[PDB]
Symmetry: D6
């Protein structure tokens, strides 16, 4: 909660990323390229190394156990917005780490990158996640209908946002 | 209204595209690269010629006057969704062409590309456009707060959608 | 047709090809890449110029009017098979060129390329085309269910074939 | 439940190549014929970002390699693909086939969101034809002299199944 | 209103090069010094997709080329850039400068959404310093022997203006 | 062997190939490029890895001793022909592997690759080899005069062939 | 004497392609099959420095294009090549063939210094076989079902002639 | 320290550089490209190896402990100026190395590179650093307003300079 | 000059440059590569377009007649020195342009490029040229023995220099 | 004889070179690559433009008629030697130009390039050429046996040389 | 003498080649590029691996001691000629191996490569080498004057040749 | 005799770089300034086939690295080059300099066949000037404020020697 730190994703963390994907078992993307294998992930990482439109970070504890991933995509440097997500590894879920990770992502987004707005998508069928985000200051701005094909059907997601002025002021 | 046809954007239409951009006077993008000049537009067109994540079309009348542009971006072939917009050239605005263009874009999206969902953004301060889209069967799914910096301030947009099942059935 | 001739597609014929696509108004492919514009067609033609897995030909009359296109795709040089299609330009449809063009494509396929089998797909909802192909010696070997998304719905197609031995013994 | 599906990786190419020499017919990678491990490896590297074919390896709980699930000719507008499954000789006849087929359909219809999957089966392997029918595939073609296999042209059934049948048949 | 700003294009490079030979100091494109039209042209092509510098040409109603608006050192995290304006000798002293400066600020603050714009002006050109002050720029530095210009090191004022001042000063 | 098996040539077999060349001591070729060294062989293998006009295979016994090489070159996928050759390692010559290797090459050529014709060249001055090939079903179709410069003089070779239809009906 | 041989150039490719569509069999350039002028042109550019095949055009005094002389499979150790000649339909039967053949042998044996030239002729064209025999070629093979031509496998004679015969037969 | 030495940055020092970045926890740049990861740092080092517009050096003690980094950027070879910065590793801060490192950077700048002017930026809200630089001979030439977004707000920096003639005459 | 102007060499001036070379009839160099033909000159111009180690300028009169060439080579941006030469077109030799051109080159070198020193080589056997340079403020600093092979023998050259401080204080 | 000048071969002179080759009707080489066609000549010229191992020059009269070619090959800058030849166009043969061309080649070789030795090959069956070279100061240093296959047989050539010290002193 | 075999030069033999060069202490060439270092030799070997204009071979004894080098350069496949040399390592000189090496080079040249003529250069100041070559059937065809700068002065070489018809018949 | 000269190789670059940090002035490779081992290594690879500069390392009988012999600005028409020698600090003052200089002249004049070698020496190092004079070099220039070294512009002697003097002085 204090002992959780954020650091830039590196090539040796791609195994972790790929293990997070196998566990979630939906289609993953790197700069909009779908991938399933570690090999393609590795190559996409190398190919987009200088692209600033997406940024990834790993959260570790004091003993360097890998806790989760913080990802910003669709980063636009004129409108100053990005989409984010966090993924916590299954073994570390439900330990109360989520809030800390979310705060670390906002801190980076609003005190380093100088973004104006961050938004995220949450499955309407995960009301507890929606609630958590609301408790961290995110507000619903959309209920996107049949937005994503997940587990054999089109599902709705809340689009939730928070502004730099709310987070900092 | 019958005499308006849609055709694939070609290299000779980039002048038209660039004239549409100067008139609207906000930042334009090609596969997420911002551009201002015809030269950069031309080079981006050549570079992304085989990329299927965005598709553009020009609407012409019977005498080949250029009426406007139909653009799909963020095309995802797993979720089967895209973002669209239409831009009508200033001299052809207010002639009642908008509805026809919108129908041509939906027709392409849902009878050729086989998309599931199309969505678009409309400035909350253009309620007449919002109404028009509603009349063509689009439904509001989001009111995105301070989404875009336009004319010196952050503005809200409606996110409006329509599904293939509604359009076809 | 007697003076319909077949010739190898060239770069100056791509305009014709692209006009054939706009008229039929379904998604077209070049070596499996979908394309909509002349520019992308041109670039794909240049990129695949040395690829032998698809071969295209243009049919002209004695005054060099462009009648249509003969296309072989999915050419496999071990099993000696290919998929064929034809597109006749709108203005030349229904004039009785189709059978002649089909025979020219079979002739090339079976007397020059030395293929064993040619097959084609025809919309089940175009029974008169199916009949025509049957009259040219093709036989139904499948009725592919919801095979293609065409004009806003999944459509069935007949798969029809003919063998080299049948064509060469007629 | 014991059997899991995972994306093919470069270290699995040996397995793939061993499966090919056992079956002893001409193999293809993105339509290029190959016979050697070295050419397989090169084709794997060259087409790594191509989404028109996707391959997966099925392993048991101890990571024995059971077989291969392959989708080719994937078209994202018609939303169709051709599938096949190859089980390693030592694992044939243990009743793994139906589980592998279900894993391939699940991926095809719940992740890739395809509409139709089809496959080819030798008309001279009626037991395979039957198996596929039991997994919900239906014959849509009997292709005549389609493939030169073992010194003669052979017929294959073309069999298919639709997303709506796989996902909603029980509703 | 007569004066419009448009993105620099390849056909404007002649104009740019003529502006350089008139001013007769060393010119740069993405930090590469150049003296010839040919090198200018090559640098234009090479950096076409670089967003760290942006250039615009100002024309009148009859498309006479009036001048150049240039942003360099554009940083999209700090949201700052360096600006300059060059008016063609024949159009100097016609009162175009303030209009051009407003067009550059408008683009910088209403389209690019930058936070801060700054510029350098020769301390030995007090009338230019005054002009910039009248357009709302404020001195934040007097850089000592910053640039070797015409055979000696000269001082420049660094002047700035913020987005909030430009957009909201009248509110 | 009965347990002679054929497998696709791989990069780790190039040493064997190069040892076969030094032993025969004539100029060797890879896709028509002459080579003498292991290094050039290796580079040519890498360069032509995707070329289907030549195919090579190594024959091994049950304990993976390397017996020889089967090579198809000049493969033409329209006329459906190829030139074949065999090289048996010196230590395995005269043990009665040759006929088995020849049958394995024909089997691959006619049951997998679906070729129509295989032909080979044999030195006219090695009449016992010519006889062997005749006993395996090859027939002389030419006696090529001063065809190859080999060991300091131009030598004649028989060109011998066999057809798919003959092999598959035996 | 009227007829001269000159190296094929890029402007002659149209002629070459017209010769191919007239003969209506599959043509090759460095073993790549081609059917179109565009692919011919690309193959010409790609193999420009390859010495394994050499082509020449025969013209009359007014630069009418008479035909093509082609050497392929040129091997500079065995000192052999395969030859063919194609005369344009309008110039066939004018008695040019023997002159062209002599020009090809002259080049092959007095400039390239080859040892052996051979050619293939359809066994069903006995008059061509005779012509070649009259120019000093000798049958060394009757290749059985060598080429699929016009819907069936056909036999060809392989005919040859040696440098020593061509140069010294009269000595 | 007397035995603090300056040496050219090498690829094996990038780990140190990256550890210095994580500790300071602001956005770092290499030839104007922002980077956060070791991997991107490494790639930018390789890409700009021949670029002379920035030069970097590592300061070590007699036992080769890494003390800090000296960086010159925006080097202009006509006006003969550069921007300098220093980063001292956390464990070596406050030990009285800073002034020695500054003098080593000035020495290199003015006795080897032959620059005319060096300038640097210091946070206005770190007045003790400003004072230190003044004691080393730097003079304030600007107070740049809201120059940098650092830790969630725009901050002012002093721009401080010193000339070759001053340093070489001290 | 009074209306002699200096402008950056461009690609359309290479013909002039090449005509200057044929007239002087010694081996010419571009970034140390010897060249004799227009074509090689053109290719070297394209290849070194971004190289700052040599800079060239053309001198024109008011009607744009081409008078000559000013060349700086071996430009070193640390020691701040360069080698200069001038070539006047034959038809404009002896008209009293030389001194004006020399002053234009020095002006550029010392007021724009901010160099410290310019030096040049002059044939010892052209004492009137040596004198001219001395009158323009250059001083002999060496007499290089058998420095250059020119017209069939090794020739001596004076090396002459002038410093920025001298030029800017005149 | 005074009015004949030497200039560096250029791309527009390749037609002339190729016409000289068709007339001589033996195998020609460019940096050891055999060529027969103008197209291959052109490409070899472009490819070896920066190679200093061979140098070519054209001799023209006052009206820019092309008289012939001066070629140096096998140029070695350590031993300071090269092989030369001259070819005069058929229409200009026998006008007494040969001597002038030879002197221009020696002048270039020994006063510009600073070579030590130049040598050339002359067919033993062209004794008048051999004599001419001897009159220009070349000396026989070899009678190379069956050196070149020319017109259907191996022929002998004289190798003739001259040194810079002889030419200049 | 029977136990000496010839094999194609490989990359692992470049050390040997480079040691032979340091010992002879004159300028060495690879496809006409001068080189002094092992690194440049290695790179030239890689660059010209497919070039057939020069061919090299190593002579080994039964225990694979490296005896020497056989080199053919200037190989012309129309005239069917090449220049050769042999270099024996200092420790193996004067053991009577020279004759065997020369015969192996001729055998390769005339029974495998099918050349017509081989020639070599021998320093006029090494009359014993000249004699040896004469004993192996080579004949003097030239005495090249001041041909090579060696040890600080220009030296003469005999050019010696032998024909395929002499060697084989 | 103990001291031998050999071509610089990639494994000697560490030595070269150590010689540079000891001398503590700006070093160059084919006119590119460098300070790091990594840039040195890259420049070595990039210019490996460039003959305009040549470097050699001098070793003793036990392969201790003594120093470096460098020729730059090598021009093969004028037949000149610039030379320098750097002896490692630990081997200075052992009397190796003259031997190294003779080895450099020997290579320059007996292998490369150059006409003239010249070098630059600090006018403030009169003992080096003397040494070079004793090895037969003659002053041909006193270059004024030629190099900025240790914070000021310094003069250098330019010294030369000709091939004919080195080879024939004793004749
Ligand atoms: Ca992928
Ligand atoms: Ca841009
Ligand atoms: Ca293959
Ligand atoms: Ca420049
Ligand atoms: Ca082809
Ligand atoms: Ca050639
Ligand atoms: Ca070299
Ligand atoms: Ca550098």
């Amino acid at each position: 909660n204090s002992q959780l730190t954020l650091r830039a994703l590196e090539r040796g963390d791609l195994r972790f990323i790929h293990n997070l994907n196998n566990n979630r078992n939906i289609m993953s993307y790197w700069f909009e390229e779908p991938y399933e294998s570690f090999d393609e992930l590795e190559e996409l990482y190398n190919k987009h190394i200088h692209d600033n439109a997406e940024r990834r970070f790993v959260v570790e504890d004091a003993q360097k156990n890998l806790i989760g991933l913080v990802e910003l995509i669709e980063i636009n440097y004129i409108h100053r917005s990005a989409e984010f997500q966090i993924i916590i590894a299954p073994e570390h879920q439900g330990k109360g780490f989520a809030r800390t990770l979310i705060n670390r992502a906002l801190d980076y987004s609003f005190t380093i990158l100088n973004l104006h707005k961050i938004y995220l998508h949450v499955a309407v069928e995960n009301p507890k996640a929606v609630h958590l985000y609301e408790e961290c200051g995110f507000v619903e701005e959309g209920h996107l209908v049949e937005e994503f094909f997940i587990n054999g059907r089109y599902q709705d997601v809340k689009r939730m946002y928070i502004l730099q002025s709310k987070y900092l002021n």
